[PDB]
């Protein structure tokens, strides 16, 4: 079938687990706890865009950092909503939590945000050509070494699904020394389901 995921291949050799803590004999419920907390932030902060979240379990008290740049408004006058969401987190996790927010510079070349973007104007009904083409030029203007974008599904032609891509530069997936960042997002429209995948090559790792 397909390839393996580049970042799944690169986990542990170039990439972090973003769950850096260790559990033993509480691994299970700890693990499903990281799943539902990720679900909570994912469908709460979907407006302000989140890419990835790192969970720390220092002295079993959970500790969170959240990435990306648009939550600069979450950091700002919305210290109240930061406190409220954190109160809901301690409502969900028993033992309390502490959260931090990390700004991301060049949020254009982060795969999660790219995929969420393409899913958004695919819901907003721009042509997939226009969406992919402006996004790819925006990333390689930002300084990415090479970007390939995917789309699949009923691309207007509901009677037969197909797939479309554009890519330039270099995207060496076969080289494990490369830094790759992968996203998938699922654009839902009246036609059914439209699939978005995107991955970014950003130079090698010495």
């Amino acid at each position: 079938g397909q390839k393996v995921n580049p970042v799944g291949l690169r986990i542990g050799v170039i990439r972090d687990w973003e769950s850096k803590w260790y559990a033993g004999k509480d691994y299970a419920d700890f693990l499903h706890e990281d799943l539902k907390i990720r679900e909570y932030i994912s469908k709460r902060l979907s407006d302000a865009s989140v890419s990835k979240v790192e969970i720390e379990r220092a002295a079993n008290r959970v500790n969170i950092t959240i990435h990306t740049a648009k939550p600069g408004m979450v950091i700002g006058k919305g210290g109240s909503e930061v406190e409220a969401l954190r109160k809901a987190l301690n409502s969900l996790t028993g033992k309390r939590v502490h959260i931090n927010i990390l700004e991301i510079k060049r949020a254009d070349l982060d795969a999660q945000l790219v995929a969420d973007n393409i899913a958004r104007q695919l819901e907003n009904r721009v042509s997939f050509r226009r969406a992919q083409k402006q996004q790819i030029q925006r990333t390689m203007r930002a300084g990415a070494q090479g970007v390939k974008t995917m789309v699949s599904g009923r691309l207007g032609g509901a009677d037969i699904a197909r797939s479309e891509y554009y890519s330039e530069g270099t995207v060496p997936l076969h080289t494990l020394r490369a830094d790759i960042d992968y996203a998938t997002s699922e654009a839902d429209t009246t036609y059914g389901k439209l699939g978005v995948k995107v991955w970014i090559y950003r130079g090698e790792v010495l």
Binding site: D47, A69, K70, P71, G72, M73, I75, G76, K77, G78, N100, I101, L102, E103, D108, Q134, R138
Partner: protein
């Protein structure tokens, strides 16, 4: 929290692209909230004028801004257009 930043009270947006700018005016509004500014301004161009009318509609449907207004005679007239937030 992030604390390495300072945010300016104005911005000049002359002589560049539409869909390049609106990515970084949304970022600039988010920066102004982090510094808690009640008022900001984005100086624009004259000739093509597409972004000059183009940005103001985005702030009208933006989730954080209530209004965008032109300048007064005591400030210099149309030399500034002002924006205020929620």
């Amino acid at each position: 929290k992030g604390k390495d930043y300072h945010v300016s009270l104005e911005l000049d947006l002359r002589g560049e692209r539409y869909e390049n700018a609106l990515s970084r005016v949304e970022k600039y509004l988010d920066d102004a909230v982090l510094a808690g500014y009640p008022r900001v301004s984005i100086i624009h161009g004259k000739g093509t004028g597409a972004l000059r009318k183009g940005v103001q509609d985005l702030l009208k449907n933006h989730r954080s801004v209530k209004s965008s207004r032109f300048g007064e005679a005591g400030e210099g007239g149309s030399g500034v257009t002002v924006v205020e937030l929620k």
